[PDB]
Amino acid sequence: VVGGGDLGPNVLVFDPSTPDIQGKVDEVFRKQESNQFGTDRYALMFKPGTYNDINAQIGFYTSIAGLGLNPDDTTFNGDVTVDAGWFDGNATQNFWRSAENLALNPVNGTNRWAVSQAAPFRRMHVKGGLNLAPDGYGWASGGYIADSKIDGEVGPYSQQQWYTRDSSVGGWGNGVWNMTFSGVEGAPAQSFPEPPYTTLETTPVSREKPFLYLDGDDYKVFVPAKRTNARGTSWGNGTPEGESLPLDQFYVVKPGATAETINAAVDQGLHLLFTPGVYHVDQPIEIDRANTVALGLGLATIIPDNGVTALKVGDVDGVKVAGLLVDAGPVNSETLVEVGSDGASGDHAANPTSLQDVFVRIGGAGPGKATTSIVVNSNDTIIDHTWVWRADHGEGVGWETNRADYGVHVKGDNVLATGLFVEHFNKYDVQWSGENGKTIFYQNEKAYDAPDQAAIQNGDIKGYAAYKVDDSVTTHEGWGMGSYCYFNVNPDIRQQHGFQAPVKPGVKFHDLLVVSLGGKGQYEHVINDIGDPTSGDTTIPSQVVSFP
């Protein structure tokens, strides 16, 4: 297998002398603005330089990034904008897009990034304010900022929840249901429940997402080294610790690539660069070599056919999976993504495997089925930004039609999730069986389409927790976690709790909430049989500050 080669027609590369950049980006946006489930994919890439009079509007399945080693190398006098015009001001479906490695001088002083899930904002320098809300302050369900510097105020306004890590902000305007911060210089003080700020001084461990850049005229991928007890940006005081890999050390995956070829590339020592597109596989992609980077551009998507697993990472150190959507096929897959083997017991603390900006979809673009979406077997794994989503709208949706029982199952020890979003599973959205797990920020919605109370009976419990720590676990800790319900098929359904965990000194939670959306169903409790039920139709959270 040969490494390197052209990035293909879905990677649009601009430099400051490119004619009609605005017209080019506008045409991508015209096509992608409302294209929620289409198969088209785009990566917009900007060579280092200064770009004037630019407003890059970002639609579905569109990534935008600069190609400098540092964010300020690629500067827009202008904006990278997501708004909600196509949905009449409602931003709750602004999914599957990304911005990375750019500096912005927004034209009116404020850049708008009004997104919901799977819309990461990484390694950005906003020289102004950042507005996360749609014009008109309608509903929005974000969001994720990492390794970024916002010189002025971040204004969430109507954003329901948000996670920011390892960043610097000049100010922070408000909280709604759950704004969580770890390692954020300028974060508002811990104040939950009012305002609902969950604030941690540092992030226990983080490792910034690898990214494509240009070293002179040569393409390379920069691979940041890990930080322990991280705080502030990695690039603020100049280039961080990390390694650069030349593009010729990557198999550049395009249409036509089989799992057999991809697997052969990894076995031969090549890393993986998935150009934007949709890749069907008839057997799992297997990454069994330590330190392999598997990096996707433009929301590159993998669909497993015939019920196979899409991606299996072996029991090795340092695998970095980033920027991929795994989209279930119509034939049920027992698992979509497995990190490590069943029973994996190896230590990877010094050099963990990570999933970053890995998104899963079951249904919505056609019928899709999977029993468990992500199984994390390997000890020390970092899950840093994931959205694992059983579709509630689109094509191929139904209680059976797109049944997906379990979202994420964590079996490894010392696993860390930062920015965990899991929604709509028929049974437990997240289950955690390994020891010493930590979650910083969780957002869940319960399945809308349970037909009746019996359909979600869980032994002698009504409903399955959105986040379940197994009763055998001795040590676990979670911060800033919310579960919301919208039982619209049968609003008489009651969900016993959002969270379930054993009662032990080393199993702790901080800042939990449950919310009924418009009275469609209600929660009886917050965690276990503790905390007040939700009531009425006005969407007021029920909260618990500390457990146990």
The residues binding Mg ion (CB under 5 A) are 92, 141
Q: Which helix (H) or strand (E) holds 505?
A: none
Does 86 carry a binding-site annotation? no
* Residue partners of 52: CB distance under 8 A and separation at least 6: 77, 78
* Residue partners of 136: CB distance under 8 A and separation at least 6: 89
Does 423 carry a binding-site annotation? yes
Does 138 carry a binding-site annotation? yes
Which residue in this structure is represented by tokens 């039609």? Answer: 401
Catalytic residue from among 243, 445, 477, 524: 445
Beta bridge partners of 412: none
C-beta of residue 307 within 8 angstroms of C-beta of residue 284:
no
Q: Token digits for 141? A: 């369900």
Distance in Å, CB of 351 to Mg ion, minimum: 18
Q: What's the maximum distance between 2 C-alpha atoms anywhere in the chain?
A: 67
Distance in Å, CB of 430 to Mg ion, minimum: 17
* Residue partners of 492: CB distance under 8 A and separation at least 6: 453, 521
* Alpha carbon distance 230, 210 (integer Å): 17
* Euclidean distance between the first and the last CA atom of the chain, given in angstroms as a whole number: 55
Is 141 or 335 the residue whose CB approaches Mg ion more closely? Answer: 141
Does 432 carry a binding-site annotation? no
Distance in Å, CB of 141 to Mg ion, minimum: 4
Is 190 or 436 the residue whose CB approaches Mg ion more closely? Answer: 436
Does 186 carry a binding-site annotation? no
Distance in Å, CB of 272 to Mg ion, minimum: 28
Is 141 or 233 the residue whose CB approaches Mg ion more closely? Answer: 141
Distance in Å, CB of 24 to Mg ion, minimum: 31
Q: Token digits for 376? A: 């994390």
Q: Token digits for 328? A: 């279930």
Q: CA-CA distances (angstroms) from residue 133 to 174, 186, 215, 482, 484?
A: 12, 20, 36, 20, 20
The CA angle 211-213-219, to the nearest 5 degrees, is 115
Is 73 or 380 the residue whose CB approaches Mg ion more closely? Answer: 380
Distance in Å, CB of 228 to Mg ion, minimum: 22
| Omega before residue 255 within 30° of 0, cis | no
What b/e readout covers 410-426, taking b as 16+ CB neighbours within 10 angstroms? bbbbbbbbbbbbbbbbb
Distance in Å, CB of 136 to Mg ion, minimum: 18
Is 86 or 107 the residue whose CB approaches Mg ion more closely? Answer: 86
Is 259 or 447 the residue whose CB approaches Mg ion more closely? Answer: 447
* Alpha carbon distance 378, 406 (integer Å): 18
Does 139 carry a binding-site annotation? yes
Distance in Å, CB of 348 to Mg ion, minimum: 12
> Do strands 461-462 and 457-458 pair parallel, antiparallel, or not at all (unpaired)?
antiparallel
Q: For the purposes of burial, counting CB atoms within 10 Å of the CB of 146, is it exposed (0-12), middle (13-18) or buried (19 or more)?
A: buried
* Alpha carbon distance 155, 67 (integer Å): 28
Is 78 or 143 the residue whose CB approaches Mg ion more closely? Answer: 143
Q: Which residue is nearest to Mg ion (CB)?
A: 141
Q: Alpha helix (H) ranges present in 278-430?
A: none
At 25 the three-state DSSP class reads helix
Is 141 or 182 the residue whose CB approaches Mg ion more closely? Answer: 141
Q: Token digits for 520? A: 């469609």
* Alpha carbon distance 255, 281 (integer Å): 11
Single-letter residue type at 316: V
Backbone angles phi, psi at 483, to 5 degrees: -130, 130
Q: After which residues is the chain broken (C to N over 2.5 A)?
A: none
Does 424 carry a binding-site annotation? yes
445 is catalytic: yes
Distance in Å, CB of 222 to Mg ion, minimum: 33
Does 144 carry a binding-site annotation? no
Binding residues for substrate: 117, 137-139, 160, 389-392, 423-424, 448
Binding residues: 117, 137-139, 160, 389-392, 423-424, 448
- Residues with a catalytic annotation lie at 445
